[PDB]
Ligand binder design. Structure first.
Ligand SMILES: [Cl-]
Ligand SMILES: [Cl-]
Lengths: 214, 214
């Protein structure tokens, strides 16, 4: 099961517009994607776009169907994210998808504002995005509210953090196998190799609903 | 490895004081505790106190030492929590511990304020505390910043949520085995059997630092 991935990220950060285009491939639990800026290099850290660069590619626990792929087969879904950084920077991202045979095309609108001049995203001191574990809650109206804190590791070993919320809006009922009585979690991690002109990343996602050990 | 647990929870919620006393036992990855209110039954849902009722009892991944038990052997640590509920209720909890041979005594001060009259904690509609996965970040000064969202499941199947932050303050350096380059997570769940006079709970905690599957 290997789908082709296509994406375009557009928007602006602190008033300056940017645009990236690219793609890659995804399978159960892993995706790889490479994107390039158009017209000019990025005016801020490329690591801020790593999470902007497809929930469809997470592996699910036995017994629970992949709700994102299931939705893609009917109506689909959108995801709206808001990241509130500890220094006041706010990143708002809206994910919309279109599907073709064996291919998912993402349209990502990203608006960043309120990042101070001293922010790590301008000092270019971020070296990697740390892993996260998302709490997903099925809610009335075919919505899933997702929440988690995240951190970027900086050159000196310290972290730059944000509190993140996602509103996943499904056109149709979320697959019944996805228990709506309790929450499920998604562990996510990425491997990044970026420059201000060419971004590259591999991402691993795993949905789970029980402790790792016994 | 079976430690005796002792605890006293005291404080007030929306101005009315309350006090509970009790104890139980804990081991690697599991604890059980029973507590009773003093003088009067609780004026709000006992489920709000489940998480107030010992990080020491989590199992750790191979290679990482239990930082809480390690600290207990030297200087110890305190934990300060703030839960911000979606309806404005705020619960502030401070955990302090004293140790005796084979026993941990918790002193828990709990202050709740701003809960509206219509809050689920007064309608008594909460039926259980959902599991959580905490993101732990080692920070300068022997502190660990912990963050996660949590939810209570209500009688009608819907949820009552909060965003939670914990500031774990260690007297001495956190054990070196606890990598300070990246974050670690703690999966936690509880089994509750409460009345407004007698609370009982079993809790399972697992610290992990890698996806559950391959
Ligand atoms: Cl511009
Ligand atoms: Cl009182």
């Amino acid at each position: 099961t290997t789908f082709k991935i296509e994406s375009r990220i557009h928007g602006n950060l602190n008033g300056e517009k940017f645009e990236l285009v690219g793609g890659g491939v995804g399978e159960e639990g892993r995706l790889e994607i490479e994107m390039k800026t158009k017209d000019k290099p990025l005016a801020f850290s490329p690591f801020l776009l790593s999470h902007c660069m497809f929930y469809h590619f997470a592996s699910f626990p036995k017994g629970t169907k992949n709700i994102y792929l299931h939705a893609a087969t009917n109506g689909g879904y959108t995801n709206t994210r808001k990241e509130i950084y500890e220094d006041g920077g706010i990143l708002e991202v809206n994910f919309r998808y279109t599907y073709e045979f064996n291919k998912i095309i993402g349209d990502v609108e990203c608006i960043g504002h309120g990042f101070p001049s001293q922010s790590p995203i301008f000092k270019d001191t971020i070296v990697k995005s740390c892993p996260t574990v998302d709490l997903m809650l099925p809610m009335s109206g075919n919505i899933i509210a997702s929440s988690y804190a995240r951190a970027f590791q900086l050159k000196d070993g310290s972290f730059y953090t944000a509190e993140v919320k996602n509103n996943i809006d499904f056109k149709n009922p979320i697959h019944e196998s996805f228990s709506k009585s309790g929450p499920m979690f998604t562990h996510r991690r990425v491997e990044e190799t970026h420059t201000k002109e060419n971004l590259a990343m591999v991402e691993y996602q795993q949905v789970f609903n029980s402790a790792p050990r016994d």
